[PDB]
């Protein structure tokens, strides 16, 4: 069965499940309240996520789960991404317990404060966003981790808009990908791959980065969808012809020759997650908070 690691085990009487946040295929999150999840106080209940197996999950399905819940511990903390709190592994189904983020995901979050057709988000605002994410992104690079879809779906918001990146641990066969396969929302996701990544199977630091570029412009055009109406084949021949996307509106020179430098056709030619975690700090601490 599951091996007992006692640095992480919750007993499931401390867990009180609740409702449906999210699912995949074989696997669903559920919002949960945690009675002592910190030794002290054991009187204190914290709202948390729990990830599980749906219930035609097969021994893949498992073994997966596994993998991302171990890839986590491995990890360790980082305020800017979705933290492992506990598990419940022992005498009944696998429960992984992460930090939750009431706002969603960040693609929502960004169009649900457009201007009418929550309050409007400041330009200082939009680069603070950008540099969170940025900042979580150097740290799992720095841990060795290679997040392989980085987008704003796959960044989430919590409760005092702290934006945390989701699924950096989640298992990924890259040679078993559809590329036709569309998210929840209707999107495809090779428009936020590198070219190296999409052509040629190779994921890197380097091609985070390029998928970087692309969460940059959706921050800033307030959760646009690249390209769209654009089809699979036809992405393949934009990205062949070196396409690049126009600059978004309300967007300085300054943050668009940031996204063109994060899609250098030549990776080693990118700037690194440390390098733009240095430049959006400069940027927001010279970016207007009153428009
Ligand atoms: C490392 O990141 C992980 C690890 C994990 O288990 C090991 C589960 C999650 N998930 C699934 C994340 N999937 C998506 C595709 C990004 C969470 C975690 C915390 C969550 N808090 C709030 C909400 C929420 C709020 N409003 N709405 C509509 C949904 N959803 C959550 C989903 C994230």
Redesign the pocket.
């Known amino acids: 069965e599951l091996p007992e690691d006692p640095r992480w085990e919750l007993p499931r009487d401390r867990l009180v499940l609740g409702k449906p946040?999210?699912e995949g295929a074989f696997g669903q999150?559920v919002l949960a309240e945690a009675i002592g999840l910190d030794k002290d106080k054991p009187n204190r209940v914290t709202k948390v996520?729990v990830?599980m197996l749906k219930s035609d999950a097969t021994e893949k399905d498992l073994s997966d789960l596994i993998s991302?819940?171990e890839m986590?511990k491995m990890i360790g903390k980082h305020k800017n991404?979705?933290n492992l709190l506990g598990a419940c592994t022992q005498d009944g189904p696998l429960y992984?317990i992460?930090?939750?983020?009431?706002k969603?995901?960040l693609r929502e979050y960004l169009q649900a404060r457009r201007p009418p057709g929550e309050e409007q988000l400041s330009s200082k605002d939009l680069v603070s966003c950008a540099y969170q994410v940025a900042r979580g992104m150097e740290y799992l690079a720095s841990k060795k981790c290679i997040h392989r879809d980085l987008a704003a779906?796959?960044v989430?918001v919590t409760e005092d808009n702290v934006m945390k990146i989701?699924?950096?641990?989640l298992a990924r066969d890259i040679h078993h990908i559809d590329y036709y396969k569309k998210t929840t929302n209707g999107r495809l996701p090779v428009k936020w791959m590198a070219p190296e990544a999409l052509f040629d199977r190779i994921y890197t630091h380097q091609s985070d980065v390029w998928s970087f570029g692309v969460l940059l412009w959706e921050i800033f055009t307030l959760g646009g969808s690249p390209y769209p109406g654009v089809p699979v084949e036809e992405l393949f021949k934009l990205l062949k012809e070196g396409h690049r996307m126009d600059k978004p509106s309300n967007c300085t020179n300054e943050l668009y020759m940031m996204m063109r430098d994060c899609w250098h056709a030549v990776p080693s030619q990118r700037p690194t997650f440390k390098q733009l975690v240095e430049d959006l700090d400069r940027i927001v601490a010279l970016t207007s908070n009153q428009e």
């Open positions: 946040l999210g999150v996520a990830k991302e819940m986590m991404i979705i992984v992460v930090e939750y983020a009431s969603g995901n779906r796959n989430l989701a699924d950096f641990g």
